[PDB]
Amino acid sequence: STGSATTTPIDSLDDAYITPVQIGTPAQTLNLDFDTGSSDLWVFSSETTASEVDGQTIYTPSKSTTAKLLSGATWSISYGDGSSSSGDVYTDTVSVGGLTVTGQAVESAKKVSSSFTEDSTIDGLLGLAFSTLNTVSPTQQKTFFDNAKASLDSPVFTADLGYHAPGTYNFGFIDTTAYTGSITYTAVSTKQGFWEWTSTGYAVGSGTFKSTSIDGIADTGTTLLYLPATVVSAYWAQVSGAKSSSSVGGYVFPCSATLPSFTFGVGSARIVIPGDYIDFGPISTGSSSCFGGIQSSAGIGINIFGDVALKAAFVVFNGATTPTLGFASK
Ligand SMILES: O[C@H]1C[C@H]2CC[C@@H](C1)N2Cc1ccccc1
């Protein structure tokens, strides 16, 4: 089997991407944030505290003929940005892009933090990191990808995120029309439950490539590119007037600037992030200070290849017995 679903930016900045997901019988379609940095499929629901729902579409298990309470199971998750959610668990039929899993754990939110209530466009998350990170207790649950394995033609999914445009998540096949050149594969460590890999270095604009190992994760659920302070300082030193602002919480730059590209290494291959991808616009409406898309990972404890980096590439998440990542230009 395969599946193919379109993913759409939630706003003009590509802050996140939503993908329609069918849950239950008859189908209830919710728009989920596919997150390769977490392992829970959780939704706004009929159980979510009413004052914490503002515009989201909810999953109502009582209206699904295939929903069953997963008796005793609870979940609670905290993300890298300080956001959180928790609740109870149902199993139900979940379909993405024509690919169906029966008996998927659907984690029903009873509580969500402010960042979720305040985002009407995101109805929940669909985690695509390794199932070892799933938070359900006392019986840990599998991701949608882990459950779909074995029906897939090839044990893979691909992320093809758009710049200010829709893109695609595919399950079970490589679309050889979706990228240019060849795919470069690189080793993955699953020790922390992430799609963790080691970039071979970087370049700023037209500058020379610096060969240096940068461990980090491929995380579709993180907006920005978070890299070591040395690398990030080297990038922003090429933008006149750029500075790190403690008040704003990262590097800002004059909105009148033209940003240089940023290149990262994948083995002997190179992925080039155009400068325009690194512009996240005014820090507040009407400001001439713009927020940078490359930020320091110091304090976060891991480097994160988030959407800024991933949307410059066609990315293969290879879930074979020995997982690997692949990157191609597009
Ligand atoms: O206050 C809420 C949380 C954030 C910041 C503004 C708006 C509502 N959300 C945009 C956003 C969504 C997904 C990822 C990154 C940013």
- Report the distance separating Cα 54 and Cα 43, nearest Å: 14
User: Does residue 232 sit in helix, strand or coil?
Assistant: helix
Method: X-ray
**What CATH code is assigned to 5-174?**
2.40.70.10
Query: Which of the listed residues 54, 118, 222, 291 should we mutate to test ligand 1's pocket, taking the one with most ligand atoms within 8 A of CB?
Result: 118
Q: Which of 286, 291, 298, 278 is nearest to 242 (CA)?
A: 291
Which residues lie across from 271 on neighbouring strands?
264
Alpha carbon of 116 to ligand 1 centroid (Å):
8
Let me know: does 32 contact 119? Beta carbons within 8 Å: no
Resolution value, angstrom units: 1.0
Spelled out in words, what is the top-level CATH class assigned to the domain 175-330? Answer: mainly beta
Residues 6+ apart with CB under 8 A from 51: none
Q: Which of 105, 133, 166, 126 is nearest to 35 (CA)?
A: 126
119 lines ligand 1 (CB under 6 A): yes
Q: Which of 45, 56, 169 is nearest to 110 (CA)?
A: 45
Alpha carbon of 136 to ligand 1 centroid (Å):
25
| Identity of residue 1 | S
Q: Which of 151, 150, 170 is nearest to 160 (CA)?
A: 170
Query: Which of the listed residues 7, 12, 81, 115 should we mutate to test ligand 1's pocket, taking the one with most ligand atoms within 8 A of CB?
Result: 115
* Domain extents in the chain: 5-174, 175-330
Let me know: does 135 contact 42? Beta carbons within 8 Å: no
Catalytic residues: 35, 199
Let me know: does 48 contact 110? Beta carbons within 8 Å: yes
- Tell me whether the CATH fold assigned to 5-174 matches the one assigned to 175-330: yes
Let me know: does 158 contact 315? Beta carbons within 8 Å: yes
Let me know: does 128 contact 218? Beta carbons within 8 Å: no
Angle at 322 between CA 37 and CA 194, to 5 degrees: 15
Nearest CA to ligand 1 atom 1: 115
